[PDB]
Symmetry: D2
Subunit: 218 residues, 4 copies
Amino acid sequence: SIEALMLFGSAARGESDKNSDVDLLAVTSGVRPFSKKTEQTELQFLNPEELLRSASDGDLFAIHLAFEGKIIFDTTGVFTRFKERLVIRKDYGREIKWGNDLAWYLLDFGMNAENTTLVNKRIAWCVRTIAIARLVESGKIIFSPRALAKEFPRKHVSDLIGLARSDEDSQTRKRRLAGFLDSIDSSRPSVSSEQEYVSHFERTENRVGLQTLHGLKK
Amino acid sequence: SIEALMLFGSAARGESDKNSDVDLLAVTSGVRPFSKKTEQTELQFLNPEELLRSASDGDLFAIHLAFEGKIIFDTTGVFTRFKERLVIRKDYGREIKWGNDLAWYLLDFGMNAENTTLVNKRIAWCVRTIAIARLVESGKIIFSPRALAKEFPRKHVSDLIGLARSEDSQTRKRRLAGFLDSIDSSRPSVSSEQEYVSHFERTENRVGLQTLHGLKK
Amino acid sequence: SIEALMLFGSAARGESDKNSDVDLLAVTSGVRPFSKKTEQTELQFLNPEELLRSASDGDLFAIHLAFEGKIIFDTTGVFTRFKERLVIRKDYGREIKWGNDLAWYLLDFGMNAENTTLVNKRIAWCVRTIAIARLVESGKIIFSPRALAKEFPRKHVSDLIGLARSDEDSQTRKRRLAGFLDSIDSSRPSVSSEQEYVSHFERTENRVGLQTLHGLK
Amino acid sequence: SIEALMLFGSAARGESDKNSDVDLLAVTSGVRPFSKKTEQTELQFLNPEELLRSASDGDLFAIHLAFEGKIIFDTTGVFTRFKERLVIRKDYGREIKWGNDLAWYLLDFGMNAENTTLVNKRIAWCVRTIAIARLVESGKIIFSPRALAKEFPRKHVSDLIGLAQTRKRRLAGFLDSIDSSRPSVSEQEYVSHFERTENRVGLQTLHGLY
Ligand SMILES: Nc1ncnc2c1ncn2[C@@H]1C[C@H](O)[C@H](COP(=O)(O)Oc2ccc(C[C@@H](NC(=O)[C@@H]3CCCN3)C(=O)O)cc2)O1
Ligand SMILES: Nc1ncnc2c1ncn2[C@H]1C[C@H](O)[C@H](COP(=O)(O)Oc2ccc(C[C@H](N)C(=O)O)cc2)O1
Ligand SMILES: Nc1ncnc2c1ncn2[C@H]1C[C@H](O)[C@@H](COP(=O)(O)CP(=O)(O)OP(=O)(O)O)O1
Ligand SMILES: Nc1ncnc2c1ncn2[C@H]1C[C@H](O)[C@@H](COP(=O)(O)CP(=O)(O)OP(=O)(O)O)O1
Ligand SMILES: Nc1ncnc2c1ncn2[C@H]1C[C@H](O)[C@@H](COP(=O)(O)CP(=O)(O)OP(=O)(O)O)O1
Ligand SMILES: Nc1ncnc2c1ncn2[C@H]1C[C@H](O)[C@@H](COP(=O)(O)CP(=O)(O)OP(=O)(O)O)O1
Ligand SMILES: Nc1ncnc2c1ncn2[C@H]1C[C@H](O)[C@@H](COP(=O)(O)O)O1
Ligand SMILES: [Mn+2]
Ligand SMILES: [Mn+2]
Ligand SMILES: [Mn+2]
Ligand SMILES: [Mn+2]
Ligand SMILES: [Mn+2]
Ligand SMILES: [Mn+2]
Ligand SMILES: [Mn+2]
Ligand SMILES: [Mn+2]
């Protein structure tokens, strides 16, 4: 069964934009994490242990749930134990490195891939993650696209996050992503071939990078 | 887009158990009415015009949304315009007869159908529709399966409504016949499955037409 | 200890304005009903037994809590037993008659009273009670001032309810209350003076009439 | 006039006991901060500019509202602008010092004062402000009395905070357990100390006679 249900995302902030979705977190035991999208809705499924682990580890997403989430119902108090476990870290350089390195892979290999929508979705994930992580290190808790652009005013932050649900395949994405990486003083990881990025993602445990690279194939 | 979102059903009452689903209503403009079931969740999609019509027509489901629904968000105020349009009727005999007639068909043809799940679900619909309507007529707003059996205490109400969540099969026909007796029900003047199709079309029993043709699939 | 808190009124409808208050209902065990107003906040205190009684008696205020109230927290489920006990009556002529009789007393004696604020509050109470009850009798659940004037289109409904928080002493209030009473085919009860209004309110169990009458003095 | 309403405190955590209150925050334009207490309810009134200031200055109480408060309604979106302005400070030693100095004053002079109630309220504030400051510096967000004693397990932490006879023995036992140092101060030198260190709560308490 489903122990608890939380509204998060822009709907929990009372904000909306052109193609906004509705974000719902369903806590149910004995299931591996997954999500289902259905006509502008998004259902995120987590088991209770994974929810508590994200708080103990100080996941940026866990910070969002505790900062802006709204409980719809909670029959087990799992969201209370979730907030009790939350430990906000002082250093998110690991998350910054993941978004940094995947941005370089997408720059080197993603701009002509067939799955344009996945590239755009994950280009935004890179810029979003770096912006969220850098702001938390500075003592701020920011998650909305409009506020990330104002609080982390690097080159093309708004444009690149705006790709999150776009099928835009213009080559101006490559020039803008390169300008953003330059504005944050990014350096490409010591890799070249696609196979080397795979090994580097494994070495640095960049799960989203591995999922993105493999997902672009088919 | 999605203007408003409402939690309804047993979760909105804090009465979810093990077999319970999670009921969510999403108001989206332009979409045709449909539902989607995903891992114990049920998403109901309506356009604003359809939502207001159910209020003006005093639909039993609309009374549930207005009485027990818990608004999660509503950017357009559509739920307020929904409640201002609500007109509870003093007479729900039309809805009562729809469930009464379909109950007779399921008693006469559904007890040995292949799709046992659909028959069990639609048997629960007949009993629940009748219980809800009778209680609204007396001035009560009741929708919990447990409270429907206490406030509408007819024979086997809890057992038959429980058939949606499914059990003592092959005694269902006896329990359904017992319920039809306790409500002083009468079978409509039909005696063929085609005569049931004809009766459902005259009386505009859409749930019956869907049920009958759904058992053939 | 406060076991449950509910938001009601216009804030729960998402349509409060600059002149609105914030309506909060607090349930505390072993306490008699009373109200405390604080910097445009209104705190209503009830015990669980009084709350559930208003549902069983079908109080018009209880209908509002059930169809428009939003729970802030509820550690005892008292709002769940509240809704299970609700019984909407087919007739509210008693509440209508209470509002009519008090309106006539204010018209006959209150238009030059010292406590103008109390008179303006209870004038709005009379018209609101009558409008709410009539709309409930017709199967509708209306409570906001704007919708009451639209759904109960009688003379000066909007103006008279607008006196709720007004210190206006103009005699135009008296002419408007008379025009309203004439539009609902109201008739003054067979009472001569102020003492006969007292004996009438006591005989007819008009608690609000007795409270208002002695409130001016 | 009231544009936003928020529930905070233990009721927002669903952890109210027999002696709890109901904490409500009302944002009202053009008012000075003040609070009304009505039959176990606590209404706190703020203007939007003051609410955003507490976020920009990283007030401990602002962090509580952002991570634990439950919005009842918000007609202006001020709570989102409130959360956008939040800047968690890298250090809260200033707050810890304020609570430490006042505790030493109350230990040296307030254990037999007339207003026994006010002494118990400010003593709890000292221990609570110190505990909450530790929790924020460590990245935690649950400011309940049980969480404070659990995460800050010094002697008699739950006893002192639980003060809303034996009070002196356990207050000194707390200062000893945290290796606290009394500031170099008489009761008149405690005044000159709070004034120099800008301990507002220490000033208003001593004159008692978020
Ligand atoms: N821990 C998280 N971190 C970052 N954001 C998260 C997290 N949880 C939920 N969200 C939000 C919700 C919001 O809606 C946004 C959509 O944007 P996103 O680009 O999908 O971001 C990601 C989404 C999921 C993952 C986890 C997993 N991938 C997947 O399960 C599927 C498989 C194909 C498509 N993804 C993985 O690789 O480990 C990683 C990134 O994601
Ligand atoms: N008008 C409503 N009456 C009762 N319930 C409704 C209604 N609308 C939505 N619901 C949800 C809430 C609950 O979950 C209930 C259980 O479903 P039921 O199957 O028992 O009852 C139905 C069977 C058929 C239909 C027709 C629909 N076009 C379809 O093709 O299905 C509709 C309902 O359905
Ligand atoms: N890369 C990331 N790292 C950590 N947390 C992240 C994240 N991306 C999103 N989040 C968090 C915050 C979102 O508000 C929230 C929903 O993520 P989302 O993809 O739905 C974007 P949202 O803020 O809802 O605006 P909208 O376009 O849908 O209207 O999940
Ligand atoms: N035949 C009918 N006529 C009018 N309204 C009806 C209805 N059947 C259900 N409803 C209303 C009320 C349900 O609570 C609500 C959800 O319908 P549901 O099928 O999910 C049964 P529920 O009350 O949620 O308990 P559970 O077994 O899921 O835990 O939809
Ligand atoms: N005479 C009556 N009979 C039955 N119920 C009555 C009632 N008067 C008020 N109510 C119910 C409904 C109000 O919305 C609700 C709050 O009553 P209220 O006096 O605060 C008027 P409200 O609807 O909130 O608009 P606003 O002027 O404050 O912006 O209490
Ligand atoms: N000295 C301080 N510095 C910063 N923040 C402080 C604070 N004292 C209290 N807070 C925050 C957190 C409380 O939950 C809340 C105070 O509310 P409260 O003083 O009523 C204690 P509470 O946590 O609600 O439990 P209970 O005893 O009422 O049941 O506001
Ligand atoms: N029984 C009842 N009737 C109407 N309003 C009620 C009642 N009980 C509480 N209230 C609340 C609702 C109003 O906002 C307010 C004005 O009541 P008023 O009596 O108009 O001064 O007091
Ligand atoms: Mn979203
Ligand atoms: Mn999303
Ligand atoms: Mn359900
Ligand atoms: Mn359902
Ligand atoms: Mn009001
Ligand atoms: Mn009021
Ligand atoms: Mn409190
Ligand atoms: Mn308090």
